[PDB]
């Protein structure tokens, strides 16, 4: 579960961090043309060269996909499964959070 969640979080973080570029162009634009290369270069540069900037004729429209919410916080579920590895061996203190966060006063009792 831990391994599958790290793959899912890595993938999610790229789409919420960078954004998925969309370019809408006139029906007249055909593949293998000057205009077509320009379209591919805009989308590529959005991802690779953000400082580059985008110049559009008024019948071309650039946008990023609206995901319509904040990225879900999957850290608590990942640490549930990760710390769960140590719980399954009969360790009775959290081996992933260790000393960090609000906790029980008496750590000694959980070591006992």
């Amino acid at each position: 579960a831990k391994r599958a969640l790290i793959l899912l979080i890595n993938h999610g973080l790229e789409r919420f961090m960078i954004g998925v570029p969309t370019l809408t162009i006139p029906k007249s634009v055909r593949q293998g043309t000057k205009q077509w290369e320009a379209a591919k270069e805009i989308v590529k540069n959005f991802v690779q060269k953000p400082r580059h900037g985008i110049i559009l004729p008024d019948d071309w429209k650039f946008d990023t996909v609206d995901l319509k919410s904040a990225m879900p916080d999957a850290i608590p579920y990942l640490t549930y499964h990760d710390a769960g590895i140590a719980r399954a061996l009969g360790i009775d203190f959290n081996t992933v959070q260790l000393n960090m966060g609000v906790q029980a006063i008496n750590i000694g009792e959980f070591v006992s």
Binding site: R87, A88, G90
Partner: protein, 87 residues
């Protein structure tokens, strides 16, 4: 002087058969469910604690009386089990 007049009887009534009402947990099919639960991390964590604490209870042998013969027989059993500080 008379022996028992009442026999030992099964814990059975209506759908309850020998203490169990749920068909999926009756007999040896039941045992397969409990076996599969041993693969759960929360079950294994609990059994590790419970079974550890049971064995650590400072086991020893109490004699039937303070009579030297009862002490002698208790010492034989102590020796058979190898009673010691760590159990």
């Amino acid at each position: 002087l008379e022996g028992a007049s009442v026999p030992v009887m099964s814990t059975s009534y209506d759908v309850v058969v020998d203490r169990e009402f749920d068909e999926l947990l009756q007999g040896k099919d039941g045992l397969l469910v409990y076996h599969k639960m041993l693969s759960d991390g929360t079950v294994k964590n609990a059994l590790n604690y419970i079974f550890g604490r049971i064995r650590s209870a400072k086991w020893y042998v109490e004699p039937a009386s303070t009579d030297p013969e009862d002490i002698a027989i208790a010492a034989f059993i102590h020796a058979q089990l190898g009673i010691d500080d760590a159990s």
